[PDB]
Amino acid sequence: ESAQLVIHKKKMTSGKEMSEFDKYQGLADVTFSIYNVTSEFYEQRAAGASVDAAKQAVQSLTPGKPVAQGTTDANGNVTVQLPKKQNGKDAVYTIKEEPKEGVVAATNMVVAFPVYEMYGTEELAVVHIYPKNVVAL
Numbered sequence: 001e002s003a004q005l006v007i008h009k010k011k012m013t014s015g016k017e018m019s020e021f022d023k024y025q026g027l028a029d030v031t032f033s034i035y036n037v038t039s040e041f042y043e044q045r046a047a048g049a050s051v052d053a054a055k056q057a058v059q060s061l062t063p064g065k066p067v068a069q070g071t072t073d074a075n076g077n078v079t080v081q082l083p084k085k086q087n088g089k090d091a092v093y094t095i096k097e098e099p100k101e102g103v104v105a106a107t108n109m110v111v112a113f114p115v116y117e118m119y120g121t122e123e124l125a126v127v128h129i130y131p132k133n134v135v136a137l
């Protein structure tokens, strides 16, 4: 009933691990805070938003206390576990990078369960993400 979310923080110059990103240095000691936006997603949906629009909307929301937080290790990685469901519904989370001196923070990202490899037929129990700031890139 929980999935692992593996967050890879890269200094940038599918849902599965992507070897392409190994060209970039991993950044240690970066904290990510993960917020439950499940209710907010379903509200957007009930108001007629598409799945994509609903995700885009809740991307800017960080309601309440983070359900999880993790700080990257020496290689730039951290795993957190997240419930696949919240209040009986397929869960949606907003992932926020905490500000850190000398680091360009990623834009907030949304992860909506279940996750399929981008879509394949097998649900992922391990989801890999690579938060980035495209405007900065």
Ligand code: NA
Binding pocket: 111, 112, 113, 114, 115, 116
């Ligand atoms: Na998804």
Ligand code: NA
Binding pocket: 009, 010, 011, 012, 104, 105, 106, 130, 131, 132, 133
């Ligand atoms: Na990044």
